[PDB]
Symmetry: D2
Subunit: 334 residues, 4 copies
């Protein structure tokens, strides 16, 4: 009946995918692997959250399990995903959220232990999906997929509405992004992203992202039409997309607002793309499960063909919820 | 002449840093300071310690009505109303109007009543607007009250000038990711004119309005109506960054754009005002960098030869404060 | 049937008192004054909160009121408390939380408007109360009282337990305190308190507090036995008391832990003084209504007569609930 | 002539010891090992410093060295210290600042590669030194020593002064401490210190420190008379000690200020312990090379036996300068 899930990497995304799994009855986490955590430590990690507040529910552990609201969840213990006995616990989907196995060569190792399918919680050299955008393109032969990046999940629904209604001639994207675990507290090594090693809480930090190019993977007609970059800034969670586009068809501000609003009420995007015309700031989206919230009042245009659209996203919570949505969506496809 | 004598109204982030910078050059001196929330004793403390630009090194003393900085007396005034300030009495030629509350010509002009000769408003204002390196030569000697634009306009306009003169900017949209400033509160608090702006500064990304990009069309008139923009205030204590997305008329390869910026940074016109980097910089790398604008070639990107996103950094406190003094020096030569 | 409350100063305390008032059926806010807010602005302020999250109910407004979960609350915008029409809306208690009427002379002006009693949300030259500590000392002739400071409400219950069980010979307190509205975001003027003008988010800032001296006002036998200081540090909310004591009688760690735990379960301190033995940090107390949470793991001693007790407090939410508690407590006294 | 130094672990302490070494002609760094940095990345990390500002000089690199102000410094990449060829570069002292070789046996591994002496940049169970307090107890058989913690270097001079003038009967210390590299930017694993895993920039975090006990080793008569703890708070650098102690001989505030002032002017403590009576905050000590600055205005007493002394320290810069001072001091002893 329920889709049984294992989590590899019980981190920000792993633990919030876990929390979200507790709030819906169609999906459940039955096993967790994190080589940095014992069951008693996992319980501590679940219980308290700087961003998303305290867990409310019963938490206990055994030597090899945690017990959440009276339900046993098996705690595995292997550094090497090839050694994880997912099959022993009837795990159908593994959420690959360590941040270190985002290549197909790595993520596929979960299959060896009998997981049926893997969702990588990051861009990867695998089929890429964004709920509301291309999740219906999933094919049952695909055993390893990814849910793209948080930024892609914010941008793609916005781009979809813009392109469908007005046509994106070309776009340049900036995302102003909260800190994440990849950044250090002080100036420290980060050999693949130099700027990314600078003290996270005390700098605006340019970062590369592939989100805007990536949108061509989920909206093929936008391939080659977007590119972008990022600034990491000192906030603990919630990020924002700043998408500057030339549009083919003229759009009044009212027409863009109305298209976003319509989209947010549509079957396709309900709960994924949201709308606001209020005077919001980033903390207002903490624990908002949208992939994207269009900010009517912050979005501007120079003229009817050149616009800057602003869209908010809880990079932790929205994405985690989308991971579960993608598991549910694709699980019906056998 | 020999030294332009300056009075500072509002001894705040900009006022005190204009003061500090004035000590580093011999062609200008501050001879009077007015700040309604400070005593001479308090002013010395303000000068001495600075969370961002570090400790003052130099001698600081005060009297009942003066501060003494490296042995030199600076008169401390005390008037809430600019109309009351005896600037002429203290031989003040230029007033730096940096309170943040007299950015209207109607208020800032009142410094003239007390005998100041010229006034430079440290903010956008309904007056002639200047950005050093871009239009300071358009200054006319009859311009008695002028402004030095915003920190953001001072960062954006040099970039826009280089792009426009080389390739022609058809249209542009600007975002600035901006450090917090005194206008934001530490906790969610009233801001009746800018609601978002009342939210806790240190804990939010806050969209904010800015006329900086439109203002570029005032300092570069052929760009009037071709630019607009906005801001996100983020939790950094100082240093901000401009993100200009524009369509170019002539094609520009990345190399061309890189070369244009570099050549501009070396030119007499922009030297020290527009700088160039190709290094992996982040915002704190520009703390106490007196540039108006540092072009970031590695962070700047483009989609094609007519559609580009240029990234440029500015110490919103220190670059601006130095440009205020540059503007004073420049315009003082025009009588 | 229900104590009717007016709020003067709809700030961090004012708005959170208001939120707290929605969760209990024995008090209700029927009028709000704030000179910086239209009704429209007031519901914005309620709706979104950087620290305590978005309002979960429904908000509307009129030209003269706000409507909160369908209940109309009259709204005012009058600078002078003497001019507030509290009586016309049958306000019994006024919460004086502007921060600028913290003197008997000023705060008493509310009674001229027909309010019956006033609770000043800060130390003042009025009878001073701390729930759980001296609130039963209230006398019906006391028409203007105060609820002390957030720090006093944290320190006093901890001090009470220590002093009553073991006797405090002497105590020296430090509070590591979150930033508040009294601090600026950049180095700015603060003529009365020079350090207090320094950029709040980028400094550890020594500050003077009266809290430890204040505890003599609610625990007379401790008068002259405590003093202390504060460091303001860059957190948006939640503070912690660090109280170093010489005890008259010896106390083992166990005895201190169990005395605090017992106190936390007593009817006297239940919900006021709480206990933890978990690995908590400050964000774990965001929206914790305790005045004080004794931290058993963080508290240390050198020996049985020399201890350092650590106690957490949400300086916004704890105190705000205590204001409603004090109103409730004293209203019974006629 | 100069003492030739190798640095193992080119992190916050490593790099700042390096910068400080350029400002004095009696010591020079000739070799650097960091397993997370190429020479190219190394000069980036020197060039830009979030806290201490841009390197003013010019940097280049080769495949095996960095060039600083025209001078070649050899770059090693060995995870295992026993494989580091210090002797080949005539390295006398190794600064062991990786944070992971803080044991006698691990730090001694540098001797195998031909280093003559090792200074561990951290608490260790080795001979422990605080400049100004016990550096003259160094003996030449001590080939592996440590320079204590930043906190011990702040506290020890303060304790020495109190104890020598008034006698410390007992003391409890808190340090309110800047974030360091051991803390993550988001809630992350910290198996041996649960609280230390919580998001650094968004919490007041109780932490343990052995500084107070350690002062008992550096000042033997204080053994067993001090203990303490820490709160990590969101600042990028600079920390403060809050020492609450009981004095044997009664002391007035005046007598304490005068003792601290006299000490600060002594040959023994000049540049090490400083004195202020100004309204300072933590950023005022950024790049202040003192081990300790006694804050006369913030320090308080309850009575003449019971005092709370506040002392500031740039935990990065003061400490890094002390490392070089200790090397200079002990190098003379052969
Ligand atoms: N944080 C975000 O905002 C966000 C949003 C969307 C996607 N992502 C992506 O999700 C992934 C995880 O990100 P995060 O922020 O949750 O990271 P994180 O650092 O919070 O969590 C990673 C977890 O993996 C664990 N781990 C490490 N090696 C492991 C191994 N061999 N086996 C098992 N567990 C292991 C770590 O102990 C840690 O708990 C990354 O790919 C990241 O890019 C992050
Ligand atoms: N901080 C920046 O990054 C920056 C950059 C460029 C321009 N500006 C502009 O410069 C102006 C000042 O900005 P700031 O950051 O220095 O502000 P600030 O709040 O730091 O300084 C304002 C100062 O004015 C004083 N003051 C207030 N009323 C006064 C009066 N009646 N008479 C005299 N002094 C009075 C205050 O006491 C304070 O010292 C504003 O217009 C601001 O927009 C700021
Ligand atoms: N913030 C805390 O953690 C805390 C805790 C306990 C007690 N307190 C005390 O409570 C009081 C309020 O503190 P706060 O943090 O909520 O401050 P705040 O600045 O957030 O709120 C003050 C409010 O009063 C309003 N106001 C100002 N003048 C007014 C007037 N004449 N009439 C009506 N409204 C007016 C302001 O517009 C603002 O909304 C202070 O005395 C403070 O010391 C604060
Ligand atoms: N940061 C402070 O304020 C401070 C002050 C005094 C002492 N200390 C102590 O000094 C030490 C270093 O602290 P830090 O803040 O500089 O840490 P850091 O994380 O900034 O620096 C440690 C460096 O060691 C490198 N490293 C790790 N393993 C290595 C190995 N096997 N070989 C070579 N290099 C390796 C890392 O790549 C990193 O650059 C710790 O013991 C710390 O407790 C820190
Ligand atoms: Na479930
Ligand atoms: Na000068
Ligand atoms: Na109620
Ligand atoms: Na040297």
């Amino acid at each position: 009946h329920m889709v049984k899930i294992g989590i590899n990497g019980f981190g920000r995304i792993g633990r919030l995918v876990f929390r979200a799994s507790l709030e819906r009855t169609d999906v459940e986490v039955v096993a967790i692997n994190d080589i940095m955590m014992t069951p008693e430590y996992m319980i501590y990690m679940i219980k308290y959250d700087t961003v998303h507040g305290k867990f409310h529910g019963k938490l206990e552990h055994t030597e090899k399990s945690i017990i959440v609201n009276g339900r046993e969840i098996h705690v595995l213990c292997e550094r090497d995903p090839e050694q994880l006995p997912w099959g022993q616990h009837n795990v159908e989907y593994v959420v690959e959220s360590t941040g270190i196995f985002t290549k197909l060569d790595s993520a596929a190792k979960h299959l060896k232990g009998g997981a049926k399918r893997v969702v990588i919680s990051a861009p990867a050299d695998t089929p890429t999906f964004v709920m509301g955008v291309n999740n219906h393109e999933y094919k049952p032969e695909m055993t390893v997929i990814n849910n793209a990046s948080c930024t892609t999940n914010c941008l793609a629904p916005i781009a979809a509405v813009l392109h469908e209604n007005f046509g994106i001639v070309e776009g340049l994207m900036t995302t102003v992004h909260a800190v994440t675990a990849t950044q250090p507290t002080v100036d420290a090594p980060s050999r693949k992203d130099w700027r990314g090693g600078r003290a996270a809480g005390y700098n605006i930090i340019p970062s590369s992202t592939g989100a805007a190019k990536a949108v061509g993977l989920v909206i093929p007609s936008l391939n080659g039409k977007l590119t972008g970059m990022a600034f990491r800034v000192p906030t603990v969670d919630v990020s924002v997309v700043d998408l500057t586009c030339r549009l083919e068809k003229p759009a009044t501000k009212k027409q863009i607002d109305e298209a976003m609003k319509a989209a947010s009420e549509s079957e396709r995007f309900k709960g994924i793309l949201k709308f606001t015309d209020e005077e919001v700031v980033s903390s207002d989206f903490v624990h908002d499960s949208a992939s994207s919230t269009y900010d009517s009042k912050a979005s501007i245009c120079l003229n009817e063909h050149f616009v800057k659209v602003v869209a908010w996203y809880d990079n932790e919570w929205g994405y985690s919820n989308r991971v579960l949505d993608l598991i549910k969506s694709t699980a019906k496809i056998q």
